[PDB]
Design a protein around this ligand. Structure first.
Ligand SMILES: CC(=O)Nc1nc(C)c(-c2cnc(F)c(NS(=O)(=O)c3sc(C)nc3C)c2)s1
Length: 578
């Protein structure tokens, strides 16, 4: 019995919560009530298997069980659409099918926190139903959310309301704390979507090379064997989470934290505070703790990998082992390099070792390897440096605007809302990284730009409209950022004609908050670029501020919502003819 095994290992609480997530990630449109009932029935069924493990259905797989249950609500499909297709199959084809229909951009109401008092009301009226609400609503919008990690956000959510609902100022305690988990959640989500896109699109080998490079950077005093044991455990975990095997994912993550903490002196000296923490806090802490000190007496890389005469020899004996070794060795020496740069280095290392060990003289040609590594290292360096000056010059909002212009011209066929969600997230790179010294930027900046770009890939993949996004997204996971960066103004694209709809907005704008008031201005800024990409110097910004003045001036003109309609049809024609 699988469900009884997981039940025992995870505890009732976590079993419930993890099962709710799985369902919300597979049936995103389905009502909250339906999912909660279904979960209760599964839990009810689980308890019986824990009692007598030979009870009728207790030897079926978790997907068999969980899919049969989901399917009691899915297999009708007027509003559900195409998810009764998956219910006409048997496992393991059904799970493939559910997975395949995960929606990165579900048409769901874009989510708005009600007042603090009403929330404390519900939190105290029934605290269970309130917290299940948070899981359901985050999970169904983030169907790849790292499920063990979603339980931690859930615990911190609960503690916020526990502390703040007993405050003299419920709002001041709770606004900052809920603002934190919101931002932290989105970031958490975007990262996890990259881990799954790698496993799902590029295959486990590609993911193995990622964690080898990351854990080596983080645990550089650890031996290779050790680093490898960890990469193997960590790969499995994420494979299971990304393939909807969430109970086993959570169980294995806990095992891995437990092992890590029981082999600390073999891994790192920065693990003290993490391993003294309640179990969800623990895995979170481990997953993202500061890199350890780099050992003193490391010999030059070049000796084992370039100067040595046994390279082609040793390479051949075990290529994947030798290449991981290289990656291990190059990474632990460079916590100042982005992960994707380390992976670019190891690919170049690989293809050089491939042609040189065939040709006339191995020793001679592969000795040059390090000059092939040169340009690859400096291209990110100059970019992160160049884009951080710009940020300090312009500040965040204008830094976002600049990249919007940049990216719109890059890939003008892309949906305007997407460009807007992507360019803003790209622009967040400045406040996040530039802060740091130059020896900590590149990983901060480039691996984050990898994540945001991945977001552009998945949103576009839904309905492809741009050949260049497809190419840049399908080619090499690791070379995506150089790819997009390399793109210039698209000349094939023929501009969009304006019309009496794309801009003529209403009076609700004034009551909107700073942020939404920015996004609308940014949405219009994209359309101005789509409609005339070329001549777009300061003539863009001279019109964008004429929208800004227009909005502000017309907002505060005591008008019965009429100045907008009147003075709005004007400036579209005016900003066109300009
Ligand atoms: C129609 C409707 O009522 N939808 C909503 N359902 C839930 C559970 C909402 C919600 C409840 N409590 C919060 F506290 C936040 N906080 S938040 O919006 O800022 C957060 S927190 C987080 C991890 N993501 C977001 C978007 C959001 S709003």
């Amino acid at each position: 019995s699988e469900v009884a095994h997981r039940f025992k290992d995870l505890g009732e609480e976590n079993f419930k919560a993890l099962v709710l997530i799985a369902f919300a990630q597979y049936l995103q449109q389905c009502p909250f009530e339906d999912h909660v009932k279904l979960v209760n029935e599964v839990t009810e069924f689980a308890k019986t298997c824990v009692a007598d493990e030979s009870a009728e259905n207790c030897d079926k797989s978790l997907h068999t069980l969980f899919g049969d249950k989901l399917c009691t609500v899915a297999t009708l499909r007027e509003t559900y659409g195409e998810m009764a297709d998956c219910c006409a199959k048997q496992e393991p084809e059904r799970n493939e099918c559910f997975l395949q229909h995960k929606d990165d951009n579900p048409n769901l109401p874009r989510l708005v926190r009600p007042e603090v008092d009403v929330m404390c009301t519900a939190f105290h009226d029934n605290e269970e139903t309130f917290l299940k609400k948070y899981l359901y609503e985050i999970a169904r919008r983030h169907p790849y959310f790292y499920a063990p990690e979603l339980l931690f956000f859930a615990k911190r959510y609960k503690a916020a309301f526990t502390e703040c609902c007993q405050a003299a100022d419920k709002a001041a305690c709770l606004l900052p704390k809920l603002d934190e988990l919101r931002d932290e959640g989105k970031a958490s989500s975007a990262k996890q979507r990259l881990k799954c896109a790698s496993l799902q699109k590029f295959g486990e080998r590609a993911f193995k090379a990622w964690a080898v490079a990351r854990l080596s950077q983080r645990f550089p005093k650890a031996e290779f064997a050790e680093v490898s044991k960890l990469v193997t455990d960590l790969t499995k975990v994420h494979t299971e989470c990304c393939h909807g095997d969430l109970l086993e994912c959570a169980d294995d993550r806990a095992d891995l934290a437990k092992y890590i903490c029981e082999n600390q002196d073999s891994i790192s000296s920065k693990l003290k505070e993490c391993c003294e923490k309640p179990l969800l806090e623990k895995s979170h802490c481990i997953a993202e703790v500061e890199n350890d000190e780099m050992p003193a007496d490391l010999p030059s890389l070049a000796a084992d990998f370039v100067e040595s005469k046994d390279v082609c020899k040793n390479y051949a004996e075990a290529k994947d082992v030798f290449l991981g070794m290289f990656l291990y060795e190059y990474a632990r020496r460079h916590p100042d390099y982005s992960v994707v740069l380390l992976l670019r280095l190891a690919k170049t290392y690989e293809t050089t070792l491939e042609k040189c060990c065939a040709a006339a003289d191995p020793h001679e040609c592969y000795a040059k390897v390090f000059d092939e590594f040169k340009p690859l290292v400096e291209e990110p360096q100059n970019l992160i440096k160049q884009n951080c000056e710009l940020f300090e010059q312009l500040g965040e909002y204008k830094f976002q605007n600049a990249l919007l212009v940049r990216y719109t011209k890059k890939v003008p066929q892309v949906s305007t809302p997407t460009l807007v969600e992507v360019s803003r997230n790209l622009g967040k790179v400045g406040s996040k990284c530039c802060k740091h010294p130059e020896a900590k930027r590149m990983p901060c900046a480039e691996d984050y730009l990898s994540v945001v770009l991945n977001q552009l890939c998945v949103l576009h993949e839904k309905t492809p409209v741009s050949d260049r996004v497809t190419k840049c997204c399908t080619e090499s996971l690791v070379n995506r950022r150089p790819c997009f960066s390399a793109l210039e103004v698209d000349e094939t694209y023929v501009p969009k004609e304006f019309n009496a709809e794309t801009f003529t907005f209403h009076a609700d704008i004034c009551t909107l908050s700073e942020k939404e008031r920015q996004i609308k201005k940014q949405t219009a800024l994209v359309e101005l670029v789509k409609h005339k990409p070329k001549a777009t110097k300061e003539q863009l910004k001279a019109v964008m501020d004429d929208f800004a003045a227009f909005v502000e001036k017309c907002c505060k003109a005591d008008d019965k919502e009429t100045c907008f309609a009147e003075e709005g049809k004007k400036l579209v024609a005016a900003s066109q003819a300009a």
